[PDB]
Amino acid sequence: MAEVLSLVDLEIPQVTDKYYKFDTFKHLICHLFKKTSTETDSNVPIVIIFPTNTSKLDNLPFSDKSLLIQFFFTHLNILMIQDEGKLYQEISSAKELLTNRISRVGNWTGTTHFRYSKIAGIIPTMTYILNCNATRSEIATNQLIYLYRLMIEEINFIELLQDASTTRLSQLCYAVGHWSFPAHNLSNDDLVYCVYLMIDYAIKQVEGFDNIPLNELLAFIFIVRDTYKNGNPFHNFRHAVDVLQACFHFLIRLGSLPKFKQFVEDPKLDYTEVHDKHTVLIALQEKASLNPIQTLGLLVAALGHDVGHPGTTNDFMIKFSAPTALLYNDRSVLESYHASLFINKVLRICWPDLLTCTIEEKSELTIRSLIISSILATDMGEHNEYVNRLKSFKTHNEILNHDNTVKLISALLIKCADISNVTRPLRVSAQWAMVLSREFAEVELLKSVIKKDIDLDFTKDLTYDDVPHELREILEIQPDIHKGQIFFINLFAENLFNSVSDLLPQLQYTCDIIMENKLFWLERAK
Ligand SMILES: [Mg+2]
Ligand SMILES: [Zn+2]
């Protein structure tokens, strides 16, 4: 039934599938951080047994150990103990609800009441996490910051990656360098390092801004990865890092960041696995639209833009009256949720001094506000409004101040990055189309469960074969991919990228690849 993690001798065999005895709290924490390295949701309840060293982590009072687990490992369905009937019932109920992917999504979104504070005292919901992070006292906030800093002090985060060899880290530099970003060949561990490469590089360009050591940046990125649901086929940490990487390339080609040795100038090239002796991006030697701190703000927003995404859509949350849709009055439901979580859970604790920075010395617009703006901008229900705000801007008669100009460019760039799958080279674009279809099919299955149009076996989980490397095998596994892509390019992408490239000439290559991909998809519609 449960995975049991123990700091003490006690055994609870009635509920135990597998038991891990840890010598230290630090080692227990490291075990928990590594859980999001996989491609699947944690689907068993976890029981942590506490007692009724120079290490400050290991010597924390129970109240602080408990606070650490509750806050940083909310995503792992943990029951902490230090009543056999209550325990067994609680764990059994949680197991029954966690085993199956469709059950899990229903739990998070509050749309399957009929099946199932936390559910069974163990499983977190979107509203629970949202409420917890909005209502936190200043004292609780500073205590979490203290515990965050303690982990940075005692945990060596690079050691929690599976392959941090010089060759691998160099390969990731060159991967980050390709417009054909091979996201599907990168593990969730590789992806953490990719984020480090991009954010460290951006931080180094900001004048009055202290550089942040490797370990501190890695801790932050582990925390971000932990807010993404690993079992989501599309809206997972890999998507976030992909969108960040798209933004990263846009910003380089706009001159907001300098090019680096590992940057591949030609965006139409496919990925080649290259390496050399460098393990970080090596910079080479009028103003760009976005300055260095605004560039960093855009990158940070792209990183957090889908935090906590439950694997559904605004349409689903609205039509099925999900609690979060009721809170947000059907307006930008998931995006409001992502913005609130990313600011109040992640950045307020991990990087509070970034939030209080302003976009320029003169301006009072904060990076907090800019990040919110950019995240909210990814709502496709508001697509037309930004397209028209671009047309009003381009028509120089109607002018914006500097603050609203920064907001608009930032909004357009993150929008383009978020829907950039059709602008990647064909093979990579197709791989994304496949995983996007998997998530679409899961949403259809969840709707059928709620409508009582299908009876699923909730004792088994959804599993997927590896995404194929070659376009050929992708098209045989699901032909008709082409019609999703034509629909999306015609009705959304072509117009946005054309319109954005008209304003920002350097991104024209995106329009070039959309057309090339469109022609191919048209060719097999025939
Ligand atoms: Mg989104
Ligand atoms: Zn997204």
Looking at the CA of 241, name the nearest ligand.
2
Q: Are 430 and 520 in contact (CB under 8 A)?
A: no
Could you tell me the distance, in angstroms and rounded to a whole number, from the CA of residue 416 to the centre of ligand 2?
Answer: 10
CB 54 within 8 A of CB 39: no
As a whole number of angstroms, the distance between CA 172 and CA 195 comes to: 10
Amino acid at 47: V
**Cα 374 to middle of ligand 1, angstroms:** 11
Q: Contact at 8 Å (CB) between 412 and 386?
A: yes
CB-based contact 296:202 (threshold 8 Å): yes
Looking at residue 56, what DSSP letter applies?
T
Cα(96) to centroid(ligand 2), Å: 30
Q: How far is the CA of 16 from the centre of ligand 1 (A)?
A: 38
Identify the three-state secondary structure at position 81: strand
> Do the strands 78-81 and 16-21 form a parallel or antiparallel pair, or are they unpaired?
unpaired
Ligand nearest to the CA of 334: 1
Distance 335 CA to ligand 1 centre (A): 6
Q: Give the technique used to solve this structure.
A: X-ray
Sequence spans of domains, the chain: 1-162, 163-526
Of the ligands numbered here, which is closest to the C-alpha atom of 314? Answer: 1
Phi, psi of 33 (to 5 degrees): -60, -35
**Which residue, among 385, 347, 382, 341, has the nearest Cα to 367 in the 3D structure?**
347
336 CA from centroid of ligand 2 (Å): 13
Q: How far apart are CA 357 and CA 341, in angstroms?
A: 19
Counting ligands in written order, the one closest to the CA of 414 is: 2
**Closest residue by Cα to residue 413 from 264, 300, 525, 316:** 300
CA 4 to centroid of ligand 2, rounded, Å: 34
Is 275 annotated among the ligand-binding residues?
Answer: no
Which tokens hold the place of 242? Answer: 């992909």
Instruction: Give the number of whichever ligand sits closest to the CA of residue 432.
Output: 2
SS3 state at 428: helix
In angstroms, rounded to a whole number, what is the distance separating the alpha carbons of residues 343 and 368?
7
How far is the centre of ligand 2, averaged over its atoms, from the C-alpha of 211 (Å)?
28
Give distance in angstroms: CA of 342 to centre of ligand 1. 12
Give first-to-last CA distance, the chain, whole Å: 52
Ligand closest in space to the Cα of 379:
1
Token look-up 């203290």 returns 146
Question: Does residue 418 have a known ligand-binding role?
Answer: yes
Buried/exposed 396-419: b ≥16 CB within 10 Å, e otherwise: eeeeeeebeebbbbbbbbbbbbbb
Q: Which of 150, 81, 520 is nearest to 349 (CA)?
A: 150
Backbone φ/ψ region at 302: left (φ over 0), alpha (ψ -120 to 50), beta: alpha
Cα 339 to averaged position of ligand 1 atoms, centre (Å): 10
65 CA to centre of ligand 2 in angstroms: 33
Q: Is the dihedral of CA 491, 494, 496, 502 positive or negative?
A: negative
List, in order, residues 6 or more apart from 242 with CB less than 8 Å away: 181, 183, 420, 432
CA of 173 to the centre of ligand 2 (A): 23
